[PDB]
Amino acid sequence: MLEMQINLPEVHAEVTAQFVRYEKALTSNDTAVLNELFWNSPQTLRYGATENLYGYEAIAGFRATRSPNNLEREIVRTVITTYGHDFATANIEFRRLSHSQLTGRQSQTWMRTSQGWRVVAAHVSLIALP
Amino acid sequence: EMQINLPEVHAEVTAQFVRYEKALTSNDTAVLNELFWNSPQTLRYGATENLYGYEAIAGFRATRSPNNLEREIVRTVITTYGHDFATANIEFRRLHSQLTGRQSQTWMRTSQGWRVVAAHVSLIALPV
């Protein structure tokens, strides 16, 4: 039963390590790693801060041309949850070292594929902090 | 090796997603709460607030306004993984301003049925 298999420590460790790689790649604009970690499927999607992208080829195309400026941020809060052995969500709140009056949220859903853990869908947005 | 969009699973999840959307438009708070995973781990990144845990999400729904306006759906992507997991992602326009809404959910099949384990909604300005 899946609800007796929330945050199994070995699975949670695995997902957390890949999430850490993703965050480091994001801040250094390591596009190879950012693409590696997204599920290579037409179903994968990314709702970015400024665009909606459908399918791995569109997301990888977008990362190729995106500017490496104003990427740095501090993570304020993190919740990674795993379900059984093969599925997880990763959610963070962040603040960009630049833009002062907004707080950022990033959400991912991760799946264990035959090539390792991959992001199947993601969503990033910034909202006004009261 | 998770099987994608198995037909029974994909139909089931789609039917619960439709229940959720109809409850949003009618402000049927009981159904909106029923469909969220009853766990401290559940979270909801709303258009204007971040809520952590079922009790906070349910409290927020119960006390908010009958405001949630109708949407025109631009695109819907519902994907299932094996028998017990899914994602539901929609792009929408509120029938209001010129913003483009995005709503993302992840669903799990619990012992009480399909539930939302995490969700995120945001509105952005896209060029026309």
Residue numbers in the entry:
A (entry chain B): 1 to 130
B (entry chain A): 3 to 97, 99 to 131
Text taken from the publication that reported this structure:
AtzH is the first DUF3225 family protein that has been shown to possess a catabolic function, likely decarboxylating the product of AtzEG-mediated deamination of 1-carboxybiuret as part of the cyanuric acid mineralization pathway. The data presented here imply that AtzH is a decarboxylating, 1,3-dicarboxyurea amidohydrolase. AtzH belongs to NTF2-fold superfamily, which contains 38 protein families, including the AtzH family: DUF3225 (DUF: domain of unknown function). Size exclusion chromatography performed on AtzH after removal of the his-tag, suggested that the native protein had a molecular mass of ~ 29 kDa, consistent with a dimer (2 x 14,655 kDa).
We obtained the X-ray crystal structure of the AtzH. X-ray diffraction data were collected for both. Analysis with PISA gives an interfacial surface area of almost 3,200 Å2 (or about 29% of the total surface area of the protein). The AtzH active site was sought by examining the X-ray structure. However, an in silico docking simulation between the X-ray crystal structure of the AtzH dimer and 1,3-dicarboxyurea elucidated a potential active site. The arginine residues form an extensive hydrogen bonding network with the carbonyl oxygens of 1,3-dicarboxyurea. Tyr22 is positioned within 3 Å of the carbonyl carbon of one of the two terminal carboxylic acids, and Arg46 is within hydrogen-bonding distance of the hydroxyl group of Tyr22. Tyr22 and Arg46 are therefore well positioned to form a catalytic dyad, albeit one of atypical composition.
